[PDB]
Amino acid sequence: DIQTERAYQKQPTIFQNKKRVKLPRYYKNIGLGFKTPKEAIEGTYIDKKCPFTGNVSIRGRILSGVVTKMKMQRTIVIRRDYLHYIRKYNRFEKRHKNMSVHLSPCFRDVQIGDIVTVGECRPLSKTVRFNVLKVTKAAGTKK
């Protein structure tokens, strides 16, 4: 099911080789009133870069965006649309900044178009500085 790498995958904190006669799982509350999901606690995945079950702390900026690509593994590309004010032509221009953001596999059901909230943290990779905190599903798309 899991542990497909050459090295053994496990949570660093929890010890799994106590003498006997289901493994226990490390999680945490992330803070800022963001609820740790069910699939983080009940799930069997192992991700060092999960903000719920990994070695990463959310601090500084909480942002949002729209999930636009999901082709990278364990990480997604979101897209932040905003309006920049040119003061000469007393008007806005539509501008966007797409950022690579790490997508914890506790978020099992995520589709492109879903409005994701992201939290600033330590740099996870060259271009990733943001973990996904929660996913709100797209306008309609109940089916």
Binding site: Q3, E5, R6, A7, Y8, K10, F15, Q16, N17, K18, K19, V21, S100, T127
Partner: protein, 206 residues
Amino acid sequence: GISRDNWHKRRKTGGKRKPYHKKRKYELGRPAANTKIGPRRIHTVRVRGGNKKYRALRLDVGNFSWGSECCTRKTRIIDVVYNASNNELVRTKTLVKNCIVLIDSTPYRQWYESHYALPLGRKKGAKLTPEEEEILNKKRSKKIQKKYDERKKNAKISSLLEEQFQQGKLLACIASRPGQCGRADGYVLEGKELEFYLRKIKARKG
């Protein structure tokens, strides 16, 4: 020299950078330790802030931990078996963090046979001829033999470790960075970890 710079390499977009400053000091690489199994040779390196950093280049012992019953002993490192990172750091027996090394068992076998008072390892048929740990299996008082008995009730070791203690060599996972701290400390593989790494050594074997 060899740099640890974020500016020498392309952006998200794939655009090359023009460098605005020459190599800084703090943007530093020092050549890899690539520490081996031999008589203890550790070279102290001055690092940032006038603090020290111990480059192990040879290292043959380590403070390994048997986490089941929480005992740890200074034990001889005898062979590197498997490295998940690079397959060629097994032939060139390089100790790095998360290496799979064979270590001696005799400190743990000594502890077990002194704490539980049960013959562990010891291939069936033979005896102990010096009669030292033969006497350390027997000859207790009234209430302390009862203490060893209450302990003996729940003293079962796994058949995987029983096999490895029999050959005289446990499998250990290096947890310390011998390049950095100059030590080869770690833990002994047990349960799913041991079954996993024995499967990976078996797959590499043929």
